[PDB]
Amino acid sequence: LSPADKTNVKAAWGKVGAHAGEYGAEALERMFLSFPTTKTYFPHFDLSHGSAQVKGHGKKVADALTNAVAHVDDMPNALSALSDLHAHKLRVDPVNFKLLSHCLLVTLAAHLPAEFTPAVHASLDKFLASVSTVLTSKY
Amino acid sequence: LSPADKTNVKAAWGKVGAHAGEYGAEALERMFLSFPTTKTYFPHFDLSHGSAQVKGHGKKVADALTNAVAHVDDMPNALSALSDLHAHKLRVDPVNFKLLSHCLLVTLAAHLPAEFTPAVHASLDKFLASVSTVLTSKY
Amino acid sequence: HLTPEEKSAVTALWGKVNVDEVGGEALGRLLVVYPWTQRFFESFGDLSTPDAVMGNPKVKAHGKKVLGAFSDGLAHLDNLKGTFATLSELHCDKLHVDPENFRLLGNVLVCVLAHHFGKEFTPPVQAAYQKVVAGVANALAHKYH
Amino acid sequence: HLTPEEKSAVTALWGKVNVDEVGGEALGRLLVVYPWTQRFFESFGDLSTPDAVMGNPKVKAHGKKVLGAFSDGLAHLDNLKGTFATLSELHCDKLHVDPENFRLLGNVLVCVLAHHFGKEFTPPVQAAYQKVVAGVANALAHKYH
Ligand code: HEM
Ligand code: HEM
Ligand code: HEM
Ligand code: HEM
């Protein structure tokens, strides 16, 4: 990521803060309804609206992306464990990471319309691409 | 790249050898004839069979992949000049790196039947995917 | 293939869409987020920075023409292939645009609806629009098969 | 979408294809090179390494059913949407396979044909085979559209 990208991302993710987990839930919910092929990776989950499990997992995704923003310069060693989980054990199709990153961008738009400028949209797309590249590295 | 993938690539690329530039030419031909949208990036070339220009370019692409094998641990640094050409100057659609990588694998299978095992096939895909990723990293 | 209740949420949200802006906003963001797309639009002038692109007069004007073809596509959801017959011919035979990029403008459009509408843009409203843009993207890529 | 010299070259090479083994090497190479694909074949048993996958007799068995389907597609090149309509339903609504994975299997099938025919798999022959697989990949993706 360029220095202009680091700035825009850290600024934008600062202004989420506590709302982080609540936003992650909404992103997962959007993914499940918009792309029903992704629901088969979660047979052990209640996927009904306002589900206890999706709120709880929502916060686990959000915490992961915050650490990434915090460790933006050393991303492959801040997320190393999650590649093994997603690539080796869960066998997650690479196209599915583009689907979540896209629903993640629809959530930040719908919630931070003042900070979702075209230059910030581009920085966040680059950031979520990087995150995806690391998670799929064990392929 | 894993230790095994590195060994497997140095094996296959070893057997290619002095023919690399000739296979480089074939892969470009195969791509132009199979995926004819890719032609739009070479309006200044004679793209007929056995063109002097496609042979001369075959060598340049071949010599760049040989550099990359030699510098597999420092690929981002070995190709950074090529990455600025393809993203900044030429503006190459990322989807196109996938079509050239496919046409290289098709050329190698046809020429090195003994060497093109399932394991070597999988290592060579990872290697060209790694190159494509560095060549699209200014996006 | 939409349900009655999907179709009536789609059609109901579109009749409040600012037609003179969102189109440009969509096209402008595609050119900034996926910079390779700029090579198709050289004659439009200055695309060097995000500020240049969004305020480019030939971008905003071309945004209206794109959103104008979307508006035709909703009318005729039972016959998109035919509605977009001539646009598929232009885009695939004349311009040689990789279909992977029709999907990308489909999704950039969804981020913009969300941007403007906010909470009125719900997950099930999104899943309806996601179904639309995909169909548009497929219809446009028809001359490639 | 094929010339008369294209269709002839396609049919000449296909008659020479070991129907018994090419199918299996192609389904085998998919599972090794693109390992996320193994989760749809959990019950074929031991896919834990390259040599297990190419040795596994249920991969080989199933590989014949897949080549069987391509053959059947070649016979009806002017009506593919019709020929694959049932398999499209199976893959799309029941199994939930992302249609990008249909493109990958067709490209692995072209790698496998080049491994077996070497020099005979000339650029113009490959280019007719690329048209065919794009045809089949797109026909199996129909129930998503
Ligand atoms: C930005 C992208 C992603 C991030 C940051 C992310 C992060 C995480 C984290 C932190 C965990 C839990 C680790 C733990 O157990 O302590 C997890 C689990 C999981 N993720 Fe993801 N993930 C991403 C994308 C995806 C996608 C696209 C899918 C599927 C379509 C997926 C499916 C799963 C599944 C199935 C689990 C395990 C569920 C369970 O065991 O209860 N992930 N992810
Ligand atoms: C593995 C992928 C690729 C490699 C290693 C590669 C390598 C190269 C090299 C070494 C050059 C010469 C640079 C120079 O003259 O200084 C070059 C130029 C070029 N490449 Fe690529 N390339 C790749 C993929 C692509 C693809 C996919 C396209 C288009 C479909 C493309 C289009 C071009 C063009 C248009 C030029 C400039 C030709 C000229 O004006 O002389 N490249 N590439
Ligand atoms: C997915 C939905 C899309 C729609 C509905 C759409 C619609 C249109 C329309 C209506 C025109 C005007 C045709 C005319 O009246 O003469 C046009 C022109 C054009 N479109 Fe698109 N388009 C789409 C996607 C794309 C994409 C992704 C690209 C490139 C990356 C693209 C590149 C162009 C170009 C280059 C022109 C020609 C402009 C000129 O020089 O006059 N289109 N499009
Ligand atoms: C060109 C691409 C493909 C063709 C022509 C094809 C063809 C077939 C055929 C003919 C069958 C047998 C149908 C039956 O038994 O009733 C089948 C079954 C199946 N296919 Fe495919 N297929 C393709 C791609 C894929 C891909 C990419 C995957 C997974 C990534 C997949 C997963 C399956 C599975 C899981 C079965 C059922 C096996 C069982 O439980 O017995 N297919 N396919």
Author numbering:
A (entry chain CCC), B (entry chain AAA): 2 to 140
C (entry chain DDD), D (entry chain BBB): 2 to 146
Excerpt from the publication:
However, the microsecond spacing of MHz XFEL pulses raises new challenges, including possible sample damage induced by shock waves that are launched by preceding pulses in the sample-carrying jet.
Crystal structures extracted from the two data sets also differ. Here, we describe a time-resolved X-ray pump X-ray probe SFX experiment, performed at the Linac Coherent Light Source (LCLS) in Menlo Park, USA, to test the effect of a shockwave launched bythe first (pump) X-ray pulse on microcrystals further upstream in a liquid microjet, as probed by the second (probe) X-ray pulse at the upstream point after a 122.5 ns delay. Shockwaves are launched, propagating supersonically along the jet stream and outrunning the explosive gap that opens up behind them. Associated with the shock front is a nanosecond-duration pressure jump of roughly 0.1–1 GPa (1–10 kbar), which suffices to induce protein unfolding. Moreover, the upstream shock necessarily intercepts sample being carried downstream towards the XFEL scattering point. Our findings have implications for the anticipated 4.5 MHz repetition rate of EuXFEL.
